[PDB]
Amino acid sequence: CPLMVKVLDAVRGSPAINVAVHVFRKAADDTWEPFASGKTSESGELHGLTTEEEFVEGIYKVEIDTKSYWKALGISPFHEHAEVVFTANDSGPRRYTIAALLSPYSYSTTAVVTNP
Amino acid sequence: CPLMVKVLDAVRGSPAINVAVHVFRKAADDTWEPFASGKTSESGELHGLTTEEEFVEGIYKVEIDTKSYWKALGISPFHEHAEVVFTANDSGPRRYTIAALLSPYSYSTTAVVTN
Amino acid sequence: CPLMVKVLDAVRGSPAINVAVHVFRKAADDTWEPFASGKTSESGELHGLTTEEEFVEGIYKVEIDTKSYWKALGISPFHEHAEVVFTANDSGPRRYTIAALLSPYSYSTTAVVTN
Amino acid sequence: CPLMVKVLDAVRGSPAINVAVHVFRKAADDTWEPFASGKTSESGELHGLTTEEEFVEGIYKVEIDTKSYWKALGISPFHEHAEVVFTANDSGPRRYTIAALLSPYSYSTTAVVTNP
Ligand SMILES: Cc1cc(OCC(=O)O)cc(C)c1Cc1ccc(O)c(C(C)C)c1
C-alpha cells in the first residue's frame, strides 16, 4: 500500500490501538471528498487504505481521531483530532508513512516518503 | 489575550518569523468561519487575535501556513499547513498558548493552558 | 542571560514546574564538571544560570530531571532524565533557549539561538 | 532482539541512514561501561545490538551520533548527539524500540515498550 499510518502513545510508550483514521482528498471544486478510513491495529498501524491505482496526485487529509482515543482512557485531551494535510505524488508515485505521536495536550506528526 | 501562537523553526533554531496564521470557529452548519488572522513576529509570536469577550466556548481551528514559510526559505515541505483543532472551554484555565515546532517533513504542536 | 531553559508538560498542558536542571561543562579530561543548576519556575523557566563572561566556548550538557518530575505526579516515566549536549559557539548568535517538551515515554528538545 | 533503534530525518522525510549508535550500561561503581554499538541501515533501523540473556536489568544509555549525520549532509547542527537514558527490565524482560526524530536544531525521542 502506498499509504500507511502509524500511531504511538507517548504516555504509555505503546502503539495507539483502535484509533479511527479518516482520509479525504480535495476535489476539483475544492471540497473534501471521503477517500478511505480504518482503525489502527494492535501494532498501532493502519494498512490497506488505498492502492497504487487509486492514490493519484492530489491534496490529501488524514484525520486521526485522537480525542476518542484519549476519552476511552479517561482523559479529556486538548485536540479534537490530529489532521495531516499534504500534496501526494506530485513528482510521481511514492509510498507515504504518516507517523503520529500522541500526548493529551500535544502531538507530533512526521512523514516518511520513499520511492517504491 | 486568551489566545497566543508561538512558532519555532527546528532547521534554523530560531523563531519562525512572518508565518501566516488563520483562526476559524466552527459554525452551526459544521463549516469553518474565519475569525482572526495575523503573521508571527520577529520572536515567532502572534498576539491579539481575540479578546476574552469574543472568545466564547466553541470549536476552534488554528491553521499555520507552514508551506509558505518553507517555500520562502527554499526548502521542500511536506505539509500544506499545520492545523490545530480544539474545543475552548470555560471551566478550565483559559489562556491558551498554541506552541508549534516546525520541520520540513514534521511538526509538533502543544497547548499550554493556564490560569 | 546567555542560557535559558523552558520546560513544558504535554500531559497536563502546562509549564513543567519545579523541575531540577543541572548544567555541566566538558573538562579537558572529558569528564563533566558541574557548572550551574536550578529549578524551573511557575512558568516552566529557568533563568540566570550563567553570565556572558562565564559562558565561554565549550561543550555543555543540560540535564533535566524528568524522572523526579513524573514521580512527583504519580506517573511512570521511561527516561532517567533528558540530556541536551551542545557546543556553545562565539561566531553565531549566542543567546540560547533550550526548550523541552515532556511526556512520560517521550521528550523533544529544541534550541532557539538568537541575536 | 530486545533492543532496537529507529531513526528518522525530519528535514528529508526519510530514514536516517548510517547513523552511529553507541550503547552503554551503568556499572556497579556508577561508571558507563560500553555495552554495544552499530549503525542504522537503509531503513534507519539498528537491530541485533543485544540478546535476551545479555540485556539484564540496569540503567542503559543509547547515544545516537546525530552530529556526524548532519555534518555529512553539510549541516552544522546544534546537538552533539541524542542520548536516551533509561532503566530497563525492572519489572521483567521487555522489548524496547527507541525511536528518534532528527532536525538540525531539535530532536525527539520516544520509547515503545512491549511485553514479549
Ligand atoms: C511557548 C514558549 C514560551 C516561551 O517563553 C519564554 C520566552 O518567551 O522567552 C519560550 C518558548 C521557546 C516557547 C516555545 C516552546 C517552549 C517549550 C517547548 O517545549 C516548546 C515545544 C513546542 C517544543 C515550545
Ligand SMILES: Cc1cc(OCC(=O)O)cc(C)c1Cc1ccc(O)c(C(C)C)c1
Ligand atoms: C514509522 C515507524 C516505523 C516502524 O517500523 C516498524 C518497526 O520496525 O517496528 C517503527 C516505528 C516505531 C515507527 C514510528 C516512529 C519511528 C521513528 C520516529 O522518530 C517516530 C516519531 C514520530 C516519534 C515514529
